[PDB]
């Protein structure tokens, strides 16, 4: 397993250095995970989940943003047949500012 890790780490860390705009994505996905964990830690420490709709609104806005970022990264690494690298952004923006409105309506 050591050989696989050795041959994958340098490959990924060279790919992320050849393309700069693949470092914007992942270091924005990573921290999202942290946010999720933090919220979970909170519900663990305060063992009562009184506003459960608020917890869901604060956790979905992380999960459903991580998945959209991952889809954008996949569609930028090697684009899909019909759609170009410029629809990949103007569709991610629309889906993101629809999810944001849904998650702002959920929490109130």
């Amino acid at each position: 397993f050591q050989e696989t890790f050795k041959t994958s780490k340098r490959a990924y860390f060279a790919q992320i250095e050849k393309y700069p705009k693949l470092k914007l994505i992942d270091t924005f996905c990573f921290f999202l995970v942290l946010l999720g964990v933090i919220q979970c830690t909170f519900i663990i420490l305060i063992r009562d989940n009184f506003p459960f709709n608020a917890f869901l609104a604060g956790f979905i806005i992380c999960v459903g943003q991580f998945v959209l970022l991952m889809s954008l990264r996949l569609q930028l690494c090697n684009s899909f047949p019909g759609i170009s690298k410029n629809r990949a952004f103007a569709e991610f923006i629309v889906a993101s500012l629809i999810l944001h409105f849904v998650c702002l309506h959920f929490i109130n």
Partner: protein, 160 residues
């Protein structure tokens, strides 16, 4: 427009001609009936159309439309459970058949992440899409696909 995907446009008009006059659909949409099914089958088709258009192409904008029309069907009828348990079955059958691609990931994850949080906004549905057994299938497949994508990366850099 949904049969225009499965085959050429010439084979879709026939389907329309069938569904315009057929007693199995006329029975519940007669001139006087004002039930939920009156509006609940149209959306049933439209969502499926977009899902095909989203799964066949892989775009995100064709899965957000499917999520929006699935929220509209959730608001309009209590038979959304059928879609919620049929789309994951399609994705799963494509997973184990060995036809996983980078299009299923984007399409399904966008559809789920938007449709579930949108369908939670109906006061009658409430928190069921995370509590009831019916919707659990969808959630399961969500987790499953998150694994498979990572597995694909391993295939990219590991001998078969």
């Amino acid at each position: 427009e949904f049969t225009k995907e499965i085959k050429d446009a010439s084979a879709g008009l026939l389907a329309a001609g069938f569904i315009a006059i057929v007693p199995g659909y006329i029975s519940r949409s007669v001139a006087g009936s004002y039930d939920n099914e009156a509006i609940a089958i149209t959306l049933l088709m439209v969502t499926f159309m977009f899902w095909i258009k989203a799964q066949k192409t892989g775009s995100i904008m064709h899965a957000t439309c499917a999520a929006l029309f699935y929220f509209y069907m959730v608001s309009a009828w209590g038979g959304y459970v059928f879609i919620t348990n049929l789309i994951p079955l399609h994705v799963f059958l494509l997973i184990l058949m060995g036809r996983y691609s980078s299009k299923l990931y984007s399409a399904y994850t966008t559809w789920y992440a938007i449709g579930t949080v949108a369908s939670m906004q109906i006061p009658f549905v409430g928190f069921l899409p995370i509590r009831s057994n019916d919707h659990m299938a969808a959630l399961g497949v969500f987790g499953l696909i998150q694994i498979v994508a990572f597995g694909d990366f391993v295939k990219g850099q590991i001998s078969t």
